[PDB]
Amino acid sequence: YPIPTPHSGQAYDPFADFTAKWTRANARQIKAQSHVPVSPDQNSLPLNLTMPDIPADFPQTNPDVWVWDTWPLADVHGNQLSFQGWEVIFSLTADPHAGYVFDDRHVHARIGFFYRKAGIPANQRPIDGGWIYGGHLFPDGSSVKVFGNVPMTQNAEWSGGARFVKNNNVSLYYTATSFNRNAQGGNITPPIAIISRADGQIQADDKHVWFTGFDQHLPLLAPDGKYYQTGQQNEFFSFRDPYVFLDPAHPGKTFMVFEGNTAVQRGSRSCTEADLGYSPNDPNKEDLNAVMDSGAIYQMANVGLAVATNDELTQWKFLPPILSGNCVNDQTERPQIYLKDGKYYLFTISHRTTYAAGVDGPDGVYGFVGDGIRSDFIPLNGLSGLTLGNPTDLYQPAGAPYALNPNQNPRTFQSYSHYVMPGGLVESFIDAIGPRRGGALAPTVKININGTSTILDRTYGNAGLGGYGDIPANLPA
Numbered sequence: 033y034p035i036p037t038p039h040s041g042q043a044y045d046p047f048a049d050f051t052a053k054w055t056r057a058n059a060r061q062i063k064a065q066s067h068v069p070v071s072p073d074q075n076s077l078p079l080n081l082t083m084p085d086i087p088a089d090f091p092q093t094n095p096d097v098w099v100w101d102t103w104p105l106a107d108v109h110g111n112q113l114s115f116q117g118w119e120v121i122f123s124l125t126a127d128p129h130a131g132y133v134f135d136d137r138h139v140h141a142r143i144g145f146f147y148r149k150a151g152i153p154a155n156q157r158p159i160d161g162g163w164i165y166g167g168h169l170f171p172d173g174s175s176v177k178v179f180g181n182v183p184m185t186q187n188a189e190w191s192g193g194a195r196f197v198k199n200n201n202v203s204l205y206y207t208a209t210s211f212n213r214n215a216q217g218g219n220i221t222p223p224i225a226i227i228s229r230a231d232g233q234i235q236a237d238d239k240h241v242w243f244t245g246f247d248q249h250l251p252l253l254a255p256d257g258k259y260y261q262t263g264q265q266n267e268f269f270s271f272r273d274p275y276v277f278l279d280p281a282h283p284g285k286t287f288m289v290f291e292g293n294t295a296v297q298r299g300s301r302s303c304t305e306a307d308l309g310y311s312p313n314d315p316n317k318e319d320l321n322a323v324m325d326s327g328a329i330y331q332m333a334n335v336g337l338a339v340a341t342n343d344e345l346t347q348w349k350f351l352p353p354i355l356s357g358n359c360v361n362d363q364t365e366r367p368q369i370y371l372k373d374g375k376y377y378l379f380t381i382s383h384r385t386t387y388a389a390g391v392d393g394p395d396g397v398y399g400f401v402g403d404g405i406r407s408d409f410i411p412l413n414g415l416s417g418l419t420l421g422n423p424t425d426l427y428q429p430a431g432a433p434y435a436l437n438p439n440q441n442p443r444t445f446q447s448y449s450h451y452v453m454p455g456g457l458v459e460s461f462i463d464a465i466g467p468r469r470g471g472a473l474a475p476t477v478k479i480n481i482n483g484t485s486t487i488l489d490r491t492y493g494n495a496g497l498g499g500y501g502d503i504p505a506n507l508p509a
């Protein structure tokens with residue numbers, strides 16, 4: 033084994049300049065823990081960290097909608113709330129009958145909502161989960177007003193979270209994005225990404241759930257280029273996915289974690305020995321210059337933190353990043369702070385194909401534990417960071433969901449956008465299963481979170497697979 037970087041989990045002041053590193057020594061534990069698959073099996077991952085195989089005959093969530101990143105109606109404590117006996121979810125959506133292909137859908141994303149009666153066991157609902165599509169959440173043209181008169185070919189509504197909270201009772205924190213692209217998908221000018229808020233009112237009767245409002249979109253945060261990378265630093269920067277929450281350790285504050293990138297000009301040789309994570313006397317340490325020469329400098333993920341500066345939560349400021357993956361992976365997406373047993377779990381999603389040269393791991397969800405929202409985070413599962421991966425052979429090429437390598441597991445891209453719900457239930461969407469593309473919710477699964485390690489419960493639902501899109505409420509609003 034490579035020696036993993038130790039971590040204390042110790043808490044820091046949220047305002048202090050300390051960033052935990054998910055080091056190359058930590059991420060290399062994933063391949064170290066993996067085995068060459070015994071043919072015809074094509075999974076190298078430890079069984080406890082492997083998502084079960086999703087059936088190829090999965091249902092669509094809705095035949096008229098491509099659905100992907102999904103979040104529940106929630107509060108700032110992570111509870112998932114029912115409203116007047118209805119369960120409610122929000123999703124990124126696109127139109128399968130609009131002339132663009134599934135892989136080009138992201139610049140067309142609209143936030144939609146779905147609802148279903150609360151309190152029905154998953155195995156007694158329709159196989160598709162019984163979600164009723166309510167349509168677009170936001171009025172046409174309301175989100176794009178945050179950009180003003182800038183050159184633009186597309187605008188999208190990307191992920192965040194919904195908080196049940198002025199007849200308005202729902203705050204939608206999301207990512208407004210503007211693109212200025214040639215017909216070949218190349219950037220004419222860098223994309224613009226603004227973490228934004230829109231308030232509205234959920235209403236319901238015996239027949240349906242509907243929303244009013246969301247007419248006024250407030251820009252909250254755009255990257256600074258000091259802590260969070262800008263489009264001028266890197267046209268391929270990531271800045272998105274606000275998760276707004278209350279930390280019981282800091283009463284009176286409201287915090288947000290989100291996805292960013294380290295704020296350097298693209299191609300800067302800025303990785304350090306601390307990003308590699310080896311002892312100076314470790315005879316098997318990697319060489320910093322060799323790692324940067326291999327191209328690892330193009331992988332610069334971070335998880336950002338921001339705090340509200342007014343009572344209405346309409347003004348925010350950045351704090352230093354809480355986690356960085358420099359020279360490890362470019363993507364730490366949809367971060368969430370999950371509170372359990374007085375500990376702070378940071379869960380974030382990533383891709384196999386956005387790992388740096390010399391490091392490898394599956395598509396899925398990554399996890400870290402500490403004693404505060406700013407911690408020397410302990411990567412879960414043998415100091416690796418992997419929580420749950422799609423079945424994957426890390427000893428053969430990754431391929432792509434639009435071009436599966438037949439030397440690779442045809443379910444390596446079966447699910448993405450894993451979101452950890454109360455009780456360790458995990459919801460996600462289906463990307464590719466063999467030749468079939470999803471845009472539908474995946475079976476909900478269950479992880480048992482036990483201090484610094486996790487286990488996929490293979491007796492949950494049918495052999496580890498629960499209901500398609502089972503995203504249940506634990507408390508009534």
Ligand SMILES: OC[C@@]1(O)OC[C@@H](O)[C@@H](O)[C@@H]1O
Nearest residue numbers: 042043044045046048050408
């Ligand atoms: O060495 C770091 C540390 O122990 O220093 C004292 C305090 O600032 C703590 O928050 C912090 O974790």
Ligand SMILES: OC[C@@]1(O)OC[C@@H](O)[C@@H](O)[C@@H]1O
Nearest residue numbers: 085086087088089442465466
């Ligand atoms: O059971 C083996 C398999 O190849 O059978 C046909 C399809 O259902 C596939 O998804 C499945 O993996």
Ligand SMILES: OC[C@@]1(O)OC[C@@H](O)[C@@H](O)[C@@H]1O
Nearest residue numbers: 100101135138383433448463
């Ligand atoms: O939605 C899944 C995904 O793999 O689709 C293609 C790209 O847009 C990626 O950023 C994205 O994570």
Ligand SMILES: OC[C@@]1(O)OC[C@@H](O)[C@@H](O)[C@@H]1O
Nearest residue numbers: 051294302303304306356358
């Ligand atoms: O890559 C060097 C580094 O100093 O860049 C800023 C932060 O991401 C730190 O965690 C990181 O170690």
Ligand SMILES: OC[C@H]1O[C@](O)(CO)[C@@H](O)[C@@H]1O
Nearest residue numbers: 101138190191272273365366
């Ligand atoms: O779907 C739009 C974008 O947001 C994410 O889903 C979550 O960060 C990314 O994977 C994708 O590029």
Ligand SMILES: [Mg+2]
Nearest residue numbers: 168171172173
């Ligand atoms: Mg319209």
Ligand SMILES: [Mg+2]
Nearest residue numbers: 384385387392
């Ligand atoms: Mg790779």
Ligand SMILES: [Mg+2]
Nearest residue numbers: 428438439440
């Ligand atoms: Mg083969």
